[PDB]
Ligand binder design. Structure first.
Ligand SMILES: *c1nc(N)c(C#N)nc1C#N
Ligand SMILES: *c1nc(N)c(C#N)nc1C#N
Ligand SMILES: [Zn+2]
Length: 197
């Protein structure tokens, strides 16, 4: 299965991701670590990702999200939900049950099973910032734990976000590592202290 590029590429529109500050409390459902470039989140909980461009992209620009495995041994294997989570009765009517990454609160979200690579992705219309903001925000959900055997199985994943034209040509790309886990605040503090070692 063809390996998608993970190379950062701001492109003509200066495309880049951002995250707002969230903290490492016990109650946190979703927290981003700059030092790790890693997002820590709970299963099926809102993950706000901020989109930035230097200049407005043409109408019909889209934003696609795709997971891949981080380690090179596994980057050819397709990231999918585990055999147990794909049988849950949890489809919002848009997301197919095998897809790890969902978009929350956007009826124009489209889900793709690539016919040649078999990789999953979810894609939405790029939209201008809502009233009184300077970022466009997309809300993602991750539908499998990182520990789920027969799925990610403790293998780290990257989420790749690509800005695309209406034909799906690349306009820009950014990415971040993801851990879906029960206590994200605790796990973020854990991994951050290790990197200081
Ligand atoms: C998914 N969906 C349901 N309803 C249950 C239960 N009980 N477990 C999973 C999983 N994994
Ligand atoms: C996507 N689409 C539009 N129209 C705008 C604006 N303004 N920003 C993005 C992004 N990111
Ligand atoms: Zn699972």
């Amino acid at each position: 299965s063809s390996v998608p590029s993970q190379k950062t590429y701001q492109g003509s529109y200066g495309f880049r991701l951002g995250f707002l500050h969230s903290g490492t409390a016990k109650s946190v459902t979703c927290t981003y670590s700059p030092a790790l470039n890693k997002l820590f989140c709970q299963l099926a909980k809102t993950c706000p990702v901020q989109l930035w461009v230097d200049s407005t992209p043409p109408p019909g620009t889209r934003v696609r999200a795709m997971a891949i495995y981080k380690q090179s041994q596994h980057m050819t294997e397709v990231v999918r939900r585990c055999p147990h989570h794909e049988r849950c009765s949890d489809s919002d009517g848009l997301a197919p049950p095998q897809h790890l990454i969902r978009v929350e609160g956007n009826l124009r979200a489209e889900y793709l099973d690539d016919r040649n690579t078999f990789r999953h992705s979810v894609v939405v219309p790029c939209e201008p910032p809502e009233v009184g903001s300077d970022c466009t925000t997309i809300h993602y959900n991750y539908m499998c734990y990182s520990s789920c055997m027969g799925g990610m199985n403790r293998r780290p994943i990257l989420t790749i976000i690509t800005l695309e034209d209406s034909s799906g040509n690349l306009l820009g790309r950014d990415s971040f590592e993801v851990r879906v886990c029960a206590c994200p605040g605790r796990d973020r503090r854990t991994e951050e202290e290790n990197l200081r070692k």
